[PDB]
Amino acid sequence: KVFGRCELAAAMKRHGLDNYRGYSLGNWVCAAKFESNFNTQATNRNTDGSTDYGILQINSRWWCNDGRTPGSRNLCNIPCSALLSSDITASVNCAKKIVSDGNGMNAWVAWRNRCKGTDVQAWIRGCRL
Template sequence: MRSMLIVFLFSYFFARYDAKVFSQCELAKKLKAQGLDNFHSYSLANWVCMAKHESKFNTSALNTKNSDGTIDYGIFQVNNKWWCKDNKRSSKNGCNIACSKLLDDDIDDDITCIKRIVKDPNKMNAWNAWVKHCKGKDLSKYLAGCKL
């Protein structure tokens, strides 16, 4: 158990070293290039808004305060109960990815994962911050000035 904790902490701090905080427009361009504009009928602004309110565009964001004891990882706050594996709890690992991979500055695998998540029946309702801050709102400010 102790060795697992040491490995987790080492991988966590190593991943944080490779972290990146995107600018709003930089993330919008990346998401557009990866085909998220109108992916499953969600505009690009929805994805940018979600990332803003989930992580403030920080790839190393880690939320350990979920009431059910689960942890959310990375820029899109992917949950370890359903979508990634972190050796802290059993997981469905629907994205077939180690949670630590969601903490580095390469978000290509994160994007692949959120594309899988939005195909689930909950769609973007899987992200509480999206429901609270983005759903049904004017999101034009999230792409304003981005020159997409």
């Protein structure tokens, strides 16, 4: 499913993501924008073998099991395909574990290169929330 900007903002807030570990909504919506372009099915294969999956391009080396990343840790205890669903629940619950890991939203390289320190408030601007 390709979400619309305020449609995803409302789903992320609904899932506890507005201000989860201090990251206003705006940060999370800017992160999904540049990671996947709001598309729950987007997948990307990194140069280390692993593959990135879903709305928040969650990586198969640490966080989910995709059966083709040797040495992977599956810390969110989930098959990576649960992350592609049109229901963002699994993606949001995994992202909550990743932001808590010590480095916040810096885990997401497009958040720190493109979002971080921008008027992430603009990503939720005309929305009924």
